[PDB]
Design a protein around this ligand. Structure first.
Ligand code: WDY
Ligand code: FE
Ligand code: FE
Length: 299
């Protein structure tokens, strides 16, 4: 492993643990002697794993008071209906548009179907509360989340990966929970792979804004662990650079009369291995195709 990337379950910092699978992690913040928060909402099939991990750190789960959600994608909120019943005092903090997704019958259907595809034949999920019954509080762009005496995180709108996406900035710790707004970190090559699934202009503009934050010390995306050192400090800029690189590549191949399916297959070839254990089957190729369609339209 690489000294600039913490990618093991367990303790990451004095106040911070990684629960579950590093590829779809749930982060545990210690807010005080009797108060905790969760960050990122994972995939449903990981309910009992994340629960087991949680209970090793939290002896009384009624002390879990907040659960912060970056966006509505199935791999970032799948745990909520299954673990919220076990967390009687928790408040789910999510953007207005993320909360709307949980009231949309069609949207919930997609989230459930994609999560159901990841169940091993053996396992049954816990008893769930309704998606429209989650204990949510909508948070706004720029709102300060006063989680505890040493934990103050700002909500920052970061649309473009999805139309609801937000990030959470802990300025005391120069720590950004950035979800998927910078893309997928390539663990073999150390660069960002873009994840532009809604709007390229918004994705780039969000990265421009995130570069203006005070220098990061810890950068925590939706997948793959915690980045530090130069990877944190340069992350938002590097993600922006890699998105333009893919645009130029797309423009290059199209200028040679190539269909979108060619670069789609190449990108699936080069990039799909990392997420195969939580991204079911055809979705990664289809996602690459959707991203190239978006880039091709807005360029
Ligand atoms: O395609 C992905 N996710 C996804 C999930 C849910 C919906 C849509 C989506 C919406 C429109 N087109 N596609 C896309 C993906 C691919 C590779 C690594 C990661 C990490 N997080 N996600 C990743
Ligand atoms: Fe996503
Ligand atoms: Fe994701």
């Amino acid at each position: 492993s690489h000294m600039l990337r913490l990618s093991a379950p367990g303790q990451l910092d004095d106040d911070l643990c990684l629960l579950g699978d590093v590829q779809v992690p749930v982060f545990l913040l210690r807010l005080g002697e009797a108060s905790w928060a969760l960050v990122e909402g994972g995939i449903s099939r990981d309910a009992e794993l994340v629960w087991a991990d949680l209970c090793r750190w939290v002896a009384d789960p009624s002390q879990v008071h907040y659960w912060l959600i970056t966006h509505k994608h199935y791999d970032h909120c799948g745990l909520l209906p299954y673990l919220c019943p076990r967390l009687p005092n928790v408040q789910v903090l999510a953007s207005e548009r993320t909360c709307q997704a949980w009231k949309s019958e069609s949207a919930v259907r997609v989230v459930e179907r994609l999560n159901r595809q990841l169940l091993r034949a053996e396992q049954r999920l816990p008893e769930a509360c309704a998606w429209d019954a989650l204990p949510v509080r909508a948070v706004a762009d720029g709102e300060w989340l006063e989680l505890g005496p040493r934990h103050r995180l700002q909500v920052i709108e970061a649309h473009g990966h999805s139309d609801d996406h937000v990030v959470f900035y802990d300025v005391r710790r120069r720590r950004l929970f950035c979800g998927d707004a910078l893309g997928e970190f390539d663990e073999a090559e150390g660069v960002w792979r873009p994840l532009v699934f809604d709007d390229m202009e918004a994705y780039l503009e969000s990265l421009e804004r995130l570069q203006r934050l005070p220098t990061l010390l810890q950068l925590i995306p939706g997948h793959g662990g915690l980045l530090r050192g130069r990877l944190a400090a340069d992350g938002a800029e590097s993600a922006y650079t890699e998105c333009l690189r893919l645009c130029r590549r797309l423009l290059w191949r199209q200028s040679m009369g190539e269909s979108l399916d060619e670069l789609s297959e190449e990108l699936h070839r080069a990039w799909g291995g990392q997420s195969v254990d939580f991204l079911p089957g055809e979705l990664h190729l289809g996602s690459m195709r959707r991203m190239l369609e978006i880039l091709s339209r807005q360029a």
